[PDB]
Structure formats: C-alpha cells, structure tokens
Amino acid sequence: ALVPMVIEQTSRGERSFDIYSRLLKERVIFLTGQVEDHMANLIVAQMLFLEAENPEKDIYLYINSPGGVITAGMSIYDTMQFIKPDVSTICMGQAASMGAFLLTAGAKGKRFCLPNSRVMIHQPLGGYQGQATDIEIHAREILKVKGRMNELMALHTGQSLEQIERDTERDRFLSAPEAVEYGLVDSILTHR
Amino acid sequence: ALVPMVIEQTSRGERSFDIYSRLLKERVIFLTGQVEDHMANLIVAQMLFLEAENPEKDIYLYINSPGGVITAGMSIYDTMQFIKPDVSTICMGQAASMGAFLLTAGAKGKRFCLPNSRVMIHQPLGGYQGQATDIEIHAREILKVKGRMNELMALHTGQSLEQIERDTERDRFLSAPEAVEYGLVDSILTHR
Amino acid sequence: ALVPMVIEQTSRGERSFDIYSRLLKERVIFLTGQVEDHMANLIVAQMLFLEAENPEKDIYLYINSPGGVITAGMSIYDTMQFIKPDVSTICMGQAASMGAFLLTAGAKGKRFCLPNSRVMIHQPLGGYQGQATDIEIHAREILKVKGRMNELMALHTGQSLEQIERDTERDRFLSAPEAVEYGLVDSILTHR
Amino acid sequence: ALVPMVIEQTSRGERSFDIYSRLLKERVIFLTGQVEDHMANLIVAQMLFLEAENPEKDIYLYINSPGGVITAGMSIYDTMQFIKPDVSTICMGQAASMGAFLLTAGAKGKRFCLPNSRVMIHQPLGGYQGQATDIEIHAREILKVKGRMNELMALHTGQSLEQIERDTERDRFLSAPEAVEYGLVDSILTHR
Amino acid sequence: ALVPMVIEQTSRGERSFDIYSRLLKERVIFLTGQVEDHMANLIVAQMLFLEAENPEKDIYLYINSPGGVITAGMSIYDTMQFIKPDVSTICMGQAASMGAFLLTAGAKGKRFCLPNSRVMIHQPLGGYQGQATDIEIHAREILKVKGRMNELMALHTGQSLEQIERDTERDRFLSAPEAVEYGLVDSILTHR
Amino acid sequence: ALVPMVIEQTSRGERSFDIYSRLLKERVIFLTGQVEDHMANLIVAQMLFLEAENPEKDIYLYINSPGGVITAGMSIYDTMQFIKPDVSTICMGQAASMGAFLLTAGAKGKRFCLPNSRVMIHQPLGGYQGQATDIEIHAREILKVKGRMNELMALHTGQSLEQIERDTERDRFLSAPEAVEYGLVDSILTHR
Amino acid sequence: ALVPMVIEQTSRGERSFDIYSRLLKERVIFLTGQVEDHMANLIVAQMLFLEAENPEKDIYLYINSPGGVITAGMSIYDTMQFIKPDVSTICMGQAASMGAFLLTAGAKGKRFCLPNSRVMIHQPLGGYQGQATDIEIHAREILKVKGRMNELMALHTGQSLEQIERDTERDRFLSAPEAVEYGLVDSILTHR
Amino acid sequence: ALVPMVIEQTSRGERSFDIYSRLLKERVIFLTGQVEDHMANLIVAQMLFLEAENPEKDIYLYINSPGGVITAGMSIYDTMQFIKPDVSTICMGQAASMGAFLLTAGAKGKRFCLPNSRVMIHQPLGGYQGQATDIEIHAREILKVKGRMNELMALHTGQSLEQIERDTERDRFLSAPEAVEYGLVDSILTHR
Amino acid sequence: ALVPMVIEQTSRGERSFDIYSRLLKERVIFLTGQVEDHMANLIVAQMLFLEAENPEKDIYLYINSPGGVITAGMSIYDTMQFIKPDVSTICMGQAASMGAFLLTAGAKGKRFCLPNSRVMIHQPLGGYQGQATDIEIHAREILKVKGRMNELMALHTGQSLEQIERDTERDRFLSAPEAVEYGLVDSILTHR
Amino acid sequence: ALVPMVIEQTSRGERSFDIYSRLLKERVIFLTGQVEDHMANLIVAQMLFLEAENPEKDIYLYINSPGGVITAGMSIYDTMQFIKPDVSTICMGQAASMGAFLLTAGAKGKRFCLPNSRVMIHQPLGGYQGQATDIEIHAREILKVKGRMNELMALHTGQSLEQIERDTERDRFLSAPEAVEYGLVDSILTHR
C-alpha cells in the first residue's frame, strides 16, 4: 500500500488503479527525483501514450527534481518537442539543473511554477580519467554539450546567448517570480 | 499483510481496499515519517486526485512527522494552497520542523492537534562544500529560504515576523496547548 | 505464504482474507514489535476504520511489544482516547516501556493480560549532541515528556504520582499478577 | 513459486489455496525456525482463528524449531492453554529450547514425536550491560523467568521440580524414545 | 506503481495493460540501460513474439543505452537480422558503444536519431588475468571480436573498413547530424 | 620530538632524559587517560621503583583520567596503600570514576585538586551474556565490587556508607570546591 | 627521521637535540593540533619542567589549535596559573575554541597574535544518551561548565560577563586586530 | 635508510646526520606534501631556529606542495615575515594553492622557480553544515579569508587587486616563465 | 634489521652505516618504487648533498621504477639538470613512465641499461571531475604537460618531436637493446 | 628484539651487530618471501656492497621464496651476472617461480639445494584491462617476457629451449634430486 488505490466509476465501475495510473488518465505525468535512464524512459513512454490517446490535448508535467543525467533528460527533452500536444510544465518543489532545463522546455505560454518553488540553473558537470588523449576527447565532448545546453536555454527563455552563458557559470537560484522575469517560466500558478 | 484489507458494502459491495486506500476514499491523507521527494510527490498526487474527485469537500491531512527536506515539503505546501478544497491538517504524534510548517498551513480554523502531540519549530538546516564563491551563493540561497519560511510562518500564525524570527532561532518545542496559544493550530481535538 | 489465507462463508461467497484482515473484521488489532511511526500510523488507521464501522463496539488491541518511540506511541495513545468505542487492551508476551504505557491506556475494566506475560515500565530514554544551549533545550523537553508520561500513568493506574515517579526510575518488571495489583491491568485471562 | 498452490474441490466449485493455507484449513499450524515476535504473533492469530471455526476440534501444531525468544514463545504458550480445543503438538526435526518448551505444552496424551527427532532442553539465556544496579534488576528478572519455566516444565512433564532444575542446568538432548520416558511427549509416531 | 497501467477499449473494454506492454502491442520495444544477458534475452523474446504476430509490420526499437556486453548485444543483433520484418531503430538520449552498434544495425532507411541524441563509438574493452599462455588465448579472442565488430560497422554504415577502424581507435562522439553524415543513421526526426 | 628531551647537570652533566623520566626523578607519576591493565602495570612499577629509591619521601601522582576498568585500578589502589611513602594525589583536568577513586585514595591531608578541575563519581558498570546461572554469578560479583568500592569511598572520604551509596547511584559531578567539602580531596591548590 | 636534529655549542659542543627539544630549552612550549589528554600531559609536563629550571623567567606558549576537549584544556589552563613564571602566549595559525580560551589565559600584557592569525570563540559542545534522569544530570553539568567558561573569559578579556555570554552564543571569529580590541590578546606582533 | 645518513667533517668529524638535518644546517628547509598543522609547526620551528643561529643570513625554503590548510599555511606565512633574515623560496615540482601562496611570500628578489616547475593559484575552498544562522557565520568568514588572501597576493605579486581576483576565481596554472611574468616569482633558476 | 648495517675503515675505523648511507658515500642514489612527492623530495636532497660534497664528480642514479606522478619527478628532473656534476642513470628492473623519463634525462653518454631491464614510455595520465568550465581548465593543463614532456624526450633522445608523439600514443615497451637503438639510453652494461 | 644482536671480536672488539649484518660480513645474503622492488633493491645494494669489499670472493645467496614480480627479480638476475665475484645460490625451503629462476642463475658449479627443499618452475603470470588495442600491446609484452625467461633458463640449465618451454606450461615441481638431474642446481648439500 505504498501507493494507494483509487476507484473510478465508468459504466460498470470496475476500475481500480494506483493513484499514479489514475492521474495519467487525466493527462498528468510526474517527473520527480533524479533524472536517469530508466525513469526518463517511462516519462517518455507516458508522453507517447498520451499523444496517441488525444493529440489535441495538453499534457501536464509536474516537475520536482534536483537534476540528473543530461542524456536521460534529453530523451525527455526531445520527446516533448517532437510530439503534437503541448506539454505544460509545472514546477513544484524544485527544478534544478536538468530539471530546470526541462521546465523551460514546456510549451510557450504554459510554463509555470507554484509560488514557493525554486528553479536553479548551472553549466553541466562531468568528468573523466584516462590518458591525456582521452581526456581531450571527453573534455571536448562536455564542452559541446555545454554549448548545446546554452543554445537551447537561450531559445526557450528569450535571453541572448551571451547572457544565458554568463548566468550559468555558477549555480544561479531563482525564486518563482524571478523565473518568470527571467523567462524560464511564463507565470506563477497561485490558486486554481 | 503488512497493511490489512478492509471490505466495504456499497451497492454490489465487492470492493476491498488496503486500509490506506479505504481512507483515501474518505478524503484522508497520511503524512508520516521524513518528508522527502518521493513521499511528497505521492501526497501531492493524492491531493490533486481528491481535488478532481470533488473540489468542494475538505481534505484531511494527518501529520506525524519529524521533519524533512524543505524543498520536498514545499511541494505539499504549495499544492495545499493551490487546490480548491480546504485542507484541514491534524497533528498527532509529532509535527516537527517541516512537519510543523505544513501543519500550520492548513485551512484557517481547521488546524487541529491531538492533546499529547508535540510541535517543534526551527530555522532551516543545510550546508555546502566548494569554493568560497560557491559557498557564498549557497549561503545566500539558504538565507533566502529562511527568510521566506519566516514570512510564511508569520502569515499563517498571526505572530509578528520579528517574533517568528526570534522563536525559531533554536529548536522550540510546543505542547498541544502551546501550539494553540501560539497560533500554530486552532484547537485541540479531545474526544469524539 | 508468510501470512496464510483464510476463508469465511457469509452471503454469496468465501472472500478469502489474510488472516490479519480476517481478524480486523472482528475488531481485533495487533500491536507487535517496536512502536515506530509507520507501525503506529497503521494502527491508528485501523482504529479509525473500526470506529466508523460501528462506534458502539469494542476494539480489541493485542499487545506484544518491547517498547518503542514515544511520539509514535502517543499517536496511538490519543486515538484510543479520542474514538468513541472502548479499546480493550490485552497483553500477551510482553508489554514493555511504551508497550506497557499503551496497555494501561485501555478502557478501564477491560485491560487484561495472559498469565505468563510480563509488563515492564521505565522512565523515557533519549539524548542529544550539540551546543550547550541546545542541550539545555533538549534536556528540558525530555524532562517535560517524562513528567507528562508520569501523569498519564498515575491517571490510568490509580497510583499516586509520586509512587509512579519512584517506580519508574529504574526498569521495573511486573508479572501478570503484579500488573493486576499495581493497577496496570484489571485482570488476568486464564481459560476460556 | 516458493510455495506451491493446491486445488481442492469443495461444493459449487474448487479453490486454489497456497499449500500453507490449505493445511491451516485442516487445523494444522507449522511452527518453524526461530521463535520471535512476528512469527509468534502469527501463530497466535492462527490458533484463535481455528478455535472460532470449531471450538470442539483439535488443533495440530507441527514443531521444527531450534528455539527462540521466550517472551514471544510465551504468548504462544498462553494462547494454547487459553483456547478451548486441545492443541496437539508434534515434534519433527527438532524441538530445542523454547521449541521443546512448547512441545511439552500440548494436550496431555496428544504430544507426539517422530522417531528420529531430537528434543533439547536448557535453562534460559540472556544478558545485560549497564550499571551494577541495573544489572541486579535484570539478573533477578531472568532468574524469575528461569524459575517460572522450570515450574511449567515440571507441570507438563510430571517430573519433580528438583529434577527439572537439575536437568536443564546444561543442554540435555533427548532422542525421541528418551522424550517419551522423560515425559516430554506421550508417544512416537512411526508408520501410518 | 513504478510502471503505470493504461486502459484501452476493445469490444467489451476489459483491457488493463502495463504501459510497456501497451507499447509492445504497437510493435514498440525499448532497449535501455546496460546491455546484458537478461535484458538482451528479453528483447530477443519480444522481437520473436512480434515477428510471429505479424511478419509484415515493422518493429520499432527505441534505444537509450550507454553500452554493455558485446556478447549479449550480439544476440539482439543476430535476431534483428534473422527475423523477417524490418527493425527500425530510433536513438534517443544516447546510443553509445554497443548501443551505437545496435542502432546502426537497423533496417536501411529506417535508422534515425532525435535531434539531441548522442551516438558514441569505440573499440571493444575487456581484459584477463592468468598465465601468459591464457593471456595469449584471450587476447586473440578479443582482437577477433574487434575485427568482427569493425566489419559489421563498415557493412552497415557504408564506411570503408579502414576508415571505420581508424575512427574507433578512441572514443568518438557524434551529434545527431554527424551520425547522419557518417552513416550511423539515415535521418533525424524533428517534429510530428 | 613527540616527547621532548631535557638535560640536567649532576656530576659530569651527561644526563639527557625524556621529559617523562625527568619528572619520574622528582617522584612525579602521571596517571592519565583511562585506567586499564597496561597503564596500571606501569604505574605500579613506577611506584615500586620510587618506594625503593627513598621510602621516606612522598610520591606525587597526577591524575587526569575519565575512568577505567577497576581491576586495573585496584592494582594501583593496593600499591598506593602498600608502599611505605605517602602518595599524594593531585587532580588536574578530571578525575572520574576510577580516577576519582584513586584521587581520594591519596594520603590523608595530601589529596589536592586544581581549581578548575572536575571530579565525578558513580557506581561501577559492567555486564554479562550467558546462561541464567552464569548471569547470576556475574551479577553477584559486580554487586560485591560495588559494595567493596562503596566501603572504600566511605573510608577515605569520611562520609557515612549510606551517604556514599546514595551519591553514587547516578553520576555525580563535583566542582573542585565541592570535592573539598565532600571529602574527596583535602584542598585546592592555587598558586605557588 | 621526521624531525630535524640541531647542534648547539656549549662547552664541549656535544649537544644534538631534536629541534623540538632545542626549543623547549629556550622555554618554548609548542601547543598544536587538538587539545586532548595526552597532548595536555606534555604541555603540562613541559610547564612544570620549565618552572623548575627557572621560576623567574617567562615561558612562551605557541598556539596553533582548532580546539579540543575542555577537560584536557583545563589542566593546561590551571597549570599556567599555578606556576610562578608568566606564561606568554602567541597565537599563530589559529586559536579556536578551547585554543582561544587558552590563548587569552596567558599573562596579561604578554598575550599576542601574529597578523594573519585567526581567533574563534564559542560556547562548549557536548552531549549525552541515556535515561531522562541521566540526561538531566549531564545537561546540568555542561551548563555549569559553560557558565564557568564564561566567567573565566570575562575575567581575562575584561569584557563584562553579559557580553561574553552574548558573544559566544554562536561562533564568533575575530581577525587578529579584532582580538586585540576585544581583549583576547594584548597586541599584534609584526616584525622582529 | 628511510632517510640516509651523511657525514660532515668539522673539528673531530664525529658528526652524522639524517640528510634532512644536514641540510637544515645549510639553512635549507623543505616544504613538501600538503600543508597541515603538524608540518607547519615543524617548519616554523625550523625557521625560528635558523633565525636565532644567524639573524643576518638567508633561509632557503624548497616548496613542492599541492596545497593544504590555509590556517596552517598562515603560521608559516607570518613566521616568514616576522623573522629577520630573508626567506628565499624556491619552487620545484609544484606549488599550488597554499604552496603557491607561500612561494610568492618569499623575499622580494629571491623568489625562484625551477624551469619545469608548475605553479597554480585559486580562491580558497571550504564548507559548512548547520543551521542557516551558522551557515551565515561561516560563509562570511571564508569570504573574509578570501578577501585577505587576495590582498596579500596583490601585495606580493604587484598585480592590482582586481586582477588578482579575476585570476583566482578558477584555477590558473602558470608555467615557470608565466609565474615570472605574472610576478609570483622573480626568476627561473637554470643551471649552476 | 630491514636494512643491514655495514662497516668501513677510514681513520680510527669507527664507522658503521645503513647500507643505503654507505652507498651515498660512493655517490649512488637509489630511486625506486613509484615517484611521488616524498621520495622525490629525498632524492633531491641527496643530489644536492652530493653536489656539495664534490661538484666535479659524477652521481650514479639507479632506477627501478614503474612510474610516478610527474610533478614529483620533475623536481628530480630539474635537480639533475641544475646541479653541476653529471648524473649517470642506470636502468635495471624497469623504468616505466616517469622512470623512463628520468632514464633519458641522465648525462649524455652515461645513460646505461642492464640487459634484461625494460623500459616503457607513454603519454601522461590524469583526470578531473567538476564543472565543464573546470574540466576545460584541467584538460588544457594536462595537454600542456603532455606537450612539454614530448619536447623533453625529443631533446634527450634525438628523436624528432613528431616521432615521440607517435610513439608515446600508447604504451610502448622497449627491451634493453631497443632502448639503445631508440636513444633512450646510450648503452648496455654487461660485466665489470 | 625481533632480530637478535650478536657480539664479535676484532681488534678492539667493541662490535655488536644485528645478526643479519653479521651475516653480510660473511658475505651471506638472504632472499626470502615475495620478490618485489624494495627487497630487490636491497639485495642489489648488498651485492654491490660485497663486490666492492672483495671482488674476488664469493657471495652466498640463500633463497627461500615463493616467487614474485619478474621485473623486480630481474634486477637481481642482472646484478648477479654483472658483478665480478661468483654468486653462489642455495635453495632452502622453496625456490618457486622467480625464486627458482634466481636459484639457477647462480654461478655454475655453485648452485646448491638442501635435500628436503622444493623447486617450482612455471611460465609468467600477468594480465591487463583496457581497450582491445592496449590488450594487444600488453599481451605481446608478456609473451616476450615469457620467451626471454625461457631462453635464460635453457641457458642456465642446459636443457634445450624446446624442453624448457614444454616444462613450464604448467607448474612443475621438482624435489631436490630432481632439480639436480634437471640441471637447475648442481648438487645437494647434506652435512658439513
């Protein structure tokens, strides 16, 4: 009973679904915790599934995540951009790092954060040990990602690239009103 | 059988439900143990689920918790202030730290506490290792959270901000009657 | 197969149930092992559930427990006092520490234990590391709890407070007949 | 697949039951491995359940156990004496220590032991760390328990108390025929 | 509830399938995380299952994988070539090492990567401790595998063998458009 | 030099002794850290050595010790009470448990304590695991030791035995002035 | 060797003393690292040794220490007040906590810190696990120590007691010039 | 020979010293490995010892160190400025962080660096866990240290303060010729 | 007795030394194990010591080493080039990485290698974890070291720079005759 | 007293040496335990030392060793062939692997083995983890060593090379008489 069951009436009413499944039916997906490969493969399966169910309706993605693996986050990032319905991203708790990256990637005009949430952005982390030759290859690889991460942030936020580049050198924390002013999100949901 | 099943008669009367699901059906949610992200996400899912089922009825949140991660707790904090129905919080066992924070956040007039329960409040904890430049950023980040947390306590309790500021400097323990006098809760439930 | 299934024929069928759920239907709740938050949280859910099923019938709480967390135990303690039906507590095996505390808290005249059980009572344990100022705060709080527990023992047993004060300074073991004389229980069950 | 399912025809259909439940249905309870609180708690639940189904029919307890916690074992011991139907105990494999204790506690004339099973008896073990004053308290309690166990052995076996006192000083192993002569069991089952 | 359930209507409408099974039904298989034997064993089973279901309907293989065991991966590789329907491989997130190897092994004209995927290729890793005679055996064994992998990459990508050998000497990262030019994939998916 | 060397002029002046040996010549012995067997064996050796050098001259024992094992402590205790010259004990830092006991054991009129030094007394600790029979034996011995330790405290401090028994029930801390009026020491040293 | 030997000319010149012993010969006692019992024994032994060599001449104590055990530090604290020679104290690197306490305890007018030395002061830390009765005792003792420590710094620094209590509430860092104004030290050494 | 013995001729020639001690006589001190309290205390002792031997003659400090504790390095830093003879620092191997700071602290005109030696500079590292109030205290202190450290390098290198701040935000590696141009060192030693 | 003592006669004949010190007298330095900071610091001290003893006479360095940390080895490297007397390096056992580098750094014409000794050369290893900006700084530095190391071997071996870069790409093993042809050493020693 | 001292007379006779140093004086070197680099260098130092003492007189190497690192052992192998005096080798206990290799390397006619000793010969062990390309390099590297070791034993034993290769594929154990016939040693020592 870690995850409670809920009952929903239909016709017969013979429906019992874990609360997570019940909300998926309402087109709500939760992205929480570290972004990794197995988790960011379920978010994708759910988005593809909802797109097919009704291509014309919004998908609500709740984000509460400290960050994670860029690669894993990119499969989510690309799926959101690829599919037809708008994905509306809602920040609760925190959206940090890769989490912030996905938050701003939601549909324009539909990106929003609950008022006491926190969004944090910062250049990607990584590392590599080996021969100087391999170090160069891997260093080049992370810088290309950093550059790519910066272009996409500028695209989605409206900040110039030069500005977005400066602002991510060191962890930058933004309060919900700051995320709005900056352009990571469009608004703050306050009351329903 | 860690969690027993209960049987409820309806029209057909065939449904059995983990006792926790049986209580979710009555709009009762239990918050126990440490506040973390996965737990909080589940509580938020339950609140969104109940809001959808019937926006006009109160949700009862039973709290028995030592505290936890602020960020995670804030996702509960904001959901409670977002969803349409009032959330009535009840403190049993303990409501410490973030647990107390959420307890006072319940709907005004509906914040209750059982008579032998304890409520404890205290400024946020945290920490960080890194370069002096990063230390400053993170230190600034925790102080803003503290300040924001102080503002919300004053809002929900009716205490002046200066008074909240002083009272959370060090752990402060309040007995149920003290929680009432202080304004963390509205009243004590005693006997049915 | 850790918990065997049982079946019962009622109206139209068998309804198998984990033996633990079969007994919940008879208004029997077991409290065993350490008293902690998750366990306690579940017992409270069971008591609230039974209270609703039939507010006019007794709930039997079987106790076989070495003790546990006071806070968690108080959650149970207050629910038993709050809910309308009497809770009849039965001690089997042992009721030590917080377990003994809950045993005596049952409805008067309905508190009983099996002949070879043991009941053990003692003042609360705890501790703290930190600055002398915090030590002072935490020490003061545990003493308030000790005082609070001492009053509740005296209330439920009929002993004077000073007598409880003396008796719990060091672990005190009571055989079932001594628990009866002391006033922790009303009687000893022997044979049906 | 650790535990197989078995299918038995009843009346209007047939039912698939975990083999362990299939045997509970025949009033057979298996006590194996160490005696502890959770397992003991489950055996007690099973005995109460069987007592209610048919108070006039014997319950068979199969014992194959190295021993365990006395307190937990006493809750089993007391339930066996309390409930109306005879509890017939059968020793297979081994009944050592507390297991032996429960074996002899079965209904007189119905305590059986398989031919190659071994029964072992010995005074209780325990220990304690602390101040000399606390040591003194705990030492007395274990001695009272020892005395109490000695009294019950003598009662159930027919041995004088002095003889039990001597025979449990150190581990004493008995072969099935020795258990019969000693009075731990009434007879040996051989072939059907 | 780690993996949500989805409900689909049919005739009667009684279909509740784990979301990954719901996708298997649409001819979609997900390869994520490390390539190992149990994973590979399951993918092969799924492909054979789909091949039989309808031998003339593409199978979509979603790849998000850092690499893994070559031996295990070759069972996927061989099954994909053996079975009649085309397997269309889609790279999301990443396809590194063995993952890249399988990505390029999809049906010609049907291999593609989402815009931000990374594909990484590199010669086989391995090792072995033992006597110089055994080292010699195992070293030859890994070199043959390297040679074999090099031939298959050249076959599928259209690169000459000499070129493909030079390019895998050290880890080589390719961006989605680079993978297209190189020939690891045929195209990039963009938007619905 | 973990331990510095010092030099002194005698006849020819070729005397270079570890500072600890230099002080041994002044009939100064340090007892610090916990009292176990090896440190006790060395103090005893030093005392026997000094007694032989000049039976008519006092030995100074500096105590700074949190405790000990008693048995080791008794070899020191008995040596001090055997050797002819007075052993004058000085408490610096702390004398607790075994340290306090030996401090009071110094020659009457010569037990000194530095002014910010702290002295602590408490009944002996111990413990034992085994059969109830052995538990009794070991409990019996610790109690005899406690009693023996209580008699010696009363003998050396001038307190009645009953008063000593009450005061060692729980850790009792004494400031240097308290030790003086209590009788653990005769006086406080101030300045040369 | 890890500590250099130095040669000094005297009469014959046949003196090769470890450099730390060479400095002890100049009445320099180097105190460093954390203060504990064993390191206190050496500081004290050295202090007694130098006092004997020339009761009229100053002893220089170099302090570079993060803190330590209050008790051990007090044996040093008292030795310095008892012995006749003034003890001059020099803070280099840092004097924190117990280290700061000892720094200020040097002879008035002879307490000083090198220019970039840091001094830190704060109320004592400690803790205790046990029964509420014992917790109270131990809490009572740490508070007495705190009070005693507050009085001694007020004595040595010239600050009012009320001011010391306010300042040591939380860690207070002082730059070397701040230590001078505060009164922890008398001056800053600059150049020879 | 962890450290070989060397022989010098003098008067009699009866001098044998661990090479480390031999070089100390030539006024050569080595600083290697990380800077900590014990190694700092030993260097300071050597500097004080050499200053006394001949206040007018230079001391050579060989640095090969990756960094270390600032506080400890400051004990060295201040001794070098306090004592009368110039301390000439020579960088070999590497000098980084605290090592780099100290080599620049050598006497002007005497700061040398071997040609393949590397020098690295960066802002101070640190961290802290605790209450937001304490985090604030500690964060301010590290920033003060950073500020103080930047002033001292600007003083010793001749760079403006703003330039030093710009250059230490992130690690800066300097080759020996770069250290000379920057001003960390005066010149490069080449060949005898 | 890990290291034997040997004796030798000079004047009175009273000379006994650790065999390792006996060898410094013959101007033999033994550099073994991995080159780290402490062993490098000691070799440098020995070279400086021998240079002072007789600036005109050769120093023999026996190399038997699997590698090192480079920085430490560069301090050895620079000392060898700085001091006036030729350093003749002899390779026995192995000279890998830093060992090989130092082997080529010996005085031209005096670099010898025993016939069954092996020499191994490779590009430097290293690595970093952290932000992409820091990865870039550290990657840039290891490549500069690689480049610097390549230049120095070309200088000492006579190989073109382009050839050194090709050869050190991957571990290159050379037998003693190969080292001679390549130019790492000048000749192979055979028999006295 | 791990290693005893022995006394010997000369002229003055004031000579006391660690028994192992006493044995170098008789030109005896022991080689025991695993061959690694630190002991190998110590053996080499001893051999060079004895060669210098008397180039015309034999050195006795006692071998009792399970084997070791080939590289380290080859530095002994070469020193033995390089230095002028014959090195006689005696096998006691065992000479396995590298130990056997060195045993046979002794001067012809002077390779002796005690009668109950065992000699074991076998091909080199080793291994490597990495890219197939590096595996190939390291595999070739070990085979060259295998070939090289095989040639040297054929040289020293008189066996054909083909025979040595066959006999070292698997561990080959020889008794002392077998070692003599095989040619690993020249003879067996029996009694003085």
SS3 labels along chain I: CCCCEEECCCCCCCCEEEHHHHHHCCCEEEEECCECHHHHHHHHHHHHHHHHHCCCCCEEEEEEECCECCHHHHHHHHHHHHCCCCEEEEEEEEEECHHHHHHHCCCCCCCEECCCCEEEECCCEEEEEEEHHHHHHHHHHHHHHHHHHHHHHHHHHCCCHHHHHHHCCCCEEECHHHHHHHCCCCEECCCC
Residue in J75, J86, J122, J175 annotated catalytic: J122
The answer to whether the CB of J19 falls within 8 A of the CB of J6 is: yes
B191·C81 Cβ contact <8 A:
yes
Q: Name residue B13's amino acid.
A: G
Q: Distance between CA atoms of H117 and G15, rounded to whole angstroms? A: 38
Q: Distance between CA atoms of I120 and I68, rounded to whole angstroms? A: 13
The answer to whether the CB of D175 falls within 8 A of the CB of D118 is: yes
Burial class (CB in 10 A: 0-12, 13-18, 19+), C191: exposed
Query: Residues with Cβ < 8 Å from H128, sequence gap 6 or more?
Result: B127, B128, B135, H134, H135, H138, H139
Domain ranges of chain I: 1-192
Experimental technique for the deposited model: cryo-EM
Chain C residues touching B189 at Cβ < 8 A: 82
The answer to whether the CB of F58 falls within 8 A of the CB of F88 is: yes
Residue J143's nearest CA partner among J123, J171, J121 is: J123
Residue C176's nearest CA partner among C92, C104, C106 is: C92
Chain B residues touching C78 at Cβ < 8 A: 92, 114-117
The CATH superfamily holding the domain J1-192 is 2-enoyl-CoA Hydratase; Chain A, domain 1 (3.90.226.10)
Across the interface, of G125, G143, G169, the residue whose CB is closest to C136 is G143
If you ran DSSP here, which 8-state letter would residue H101 be given? H
I191·J82 Cβ contact <8 A:
yes
Across the interface, of H18, H71, H74, the residue whose CB is closest to G1 is H18
The answer to whether the CB of B93 falls within 8 A of the CB of C75 is: yes
Residue-by-residue DSSP string for E37-92? HHHHHHHHHHHHHHHHH-TTS-EEEEEEE--B-HHHHHHHHHHHHHSSS-EEEEEE
The answer to whether the CB of I71 falls within 8 A of the CB of I38 is: no
Residue in B65, B88, B97, B117 annotated catalytic: B97
CB atoms inside a 10 Å sphere around CB H118? 26
Is residue G97 part of the annotated active site? The answer reads yes
Residue in B88, B117, B122, B156 annotated catalytic: B122
The answer to whether the CB of B100 falls within 8 A of the CB of B68 is: no
C touches G (3+ CB pairs < 8 Å)? yes
Resolution of the entry in angstroms? 2.7
Alpha carbon dihedral A29, A33, A34, A40, in 10-degree steps, equals -20
I79-117 exposure pattern, b = at least 16 Cβ within 10 A, e = fewer:
bbbbbebbbbbbbbbbbbbbbbbbbbbbbeebbbbbbbb
> Which residue of E131, E140, E144, E171 to mutate against J (max J Cβ within 10 Å)?
E131
Q: How far is C170 from chain B (nearest CA, A)?
A: 24
Q: Name residue E81's amino acid.
A: Q
CB atoms inside a 10 Å sphere around CB C144? 14
Query: Residues with Cβ < 8 Å from I69, sequence gap 6 or more?
Result: I34, I35, I36, I37, I98
Query: Residues with Cβ < 8 Å from I181, sequence gap 6 or more?
Result: none
Alpha carbon dihedral B157, B162, B166, B168, in 10-degree steps, equals 40
Is the torsion defined by CA of F21, F23, F24, F25 positive or negative? positive
The answer to whether the CB of J136 falls within 8 A of the CB of J111 is: no
Q: What are phi and psi of B85, to 5 degrees?
A: -70, 150
**Phi-psi region at J30: left, alpha or beta (left = phi > 0; alpha = psi -120 to 50):** beta
Is the torsion defined by CA of I25, I26, I27, I29 positive or negative? negative
Across the interface, of H4, H23, H64, the residue whose CB is closest to I18 is H4
SS3 call for D189: coil
Query: Residues with Cβ < 8 Å from A158, sequence gap 6 or more?
Result: A183
Helix extents (H) in chain J: 19-24, 37-53, 70-82, 98-103, 132-157, 161-167, 176-182
Which helix (H) or strand (E) segment holds residue G187: the answer is strand G187-188
Which chains reach chain D with 3 or more Cβ–Cβ distances below 8 angstroms?
Answer: C, F
Q: Name residue H11's amino acid.
A: S
What length does chain F have? 192
Q: Distance between CA atoms of G8 and D106, rounded to whole angstroms? A: 91
Q: How far is D38 from chain C (nearest CA, A)?
A: 7
Q: Name residue B157's amino acid.
A: T
Start-to-end Cα distance in chain F: 29
SS3 call for G28: strand
Distance from CA of residue E96 to its chain's centroid? 9
Is residue G171 part of the annotated active site? The answer reads yes
Q: How far is G93 from chain H (nearest CA, A)?
A: 4
Q: Distance between CA atoms of G132 and G136, rounded to whole angstroms? A: 6
Query: Residues with Cβ < 8 Å from B9, sequence gap 6 or more?
Result: none
Residue D118's nearest CA partner among D189, D173, D170 is: D173
Chain F residues touching G44 at Cβ < 8 A: 62, 92
J5-20 exposure pattern, b = at least 16 Cβ within 10 A, e = fewer:
eeeeeeeeeebebbeb
- Beta strand segments in chain H, E: 5-8, 15-18, 28-32, 59-65, 87-96, 112-113, 118-121, 125-131, 172-175, 187-188
Size of interface I-J (CB pairs under 8 A): 101
B131·H122 Cβ contact <8 A:
yes
Chain I residues touching J22 at Cβ < 8 A: none
Q: Distance between CA atoms of J5 and J22, rounded to whole angstroms? A: 9
Q: Distance between CA atoms of J181 and I15, rounded to whole angstroms? A: 47
Closest chain A residue by Cα to residue B140:
A173
- Token code pair at residue G65: 């220490």
Query: Residues with Cβ < 8 Å from G154, sequence gap 6 or more?
Result: G160, G161, G163, G164
Size of interface H-I (CB pairs under 8 A): 97
Alpha carbon dihedral H30, H35, H36, H41, in 10-degree steps, equals 30
Q: Distance between CA atoms of C104 and C89, rounded to whole angstroms? A: 8
Distance from CA of residue F110 to its chain's centroid? 13
If you ran DSSP here, which 8-state letter would residue F124 be given? P
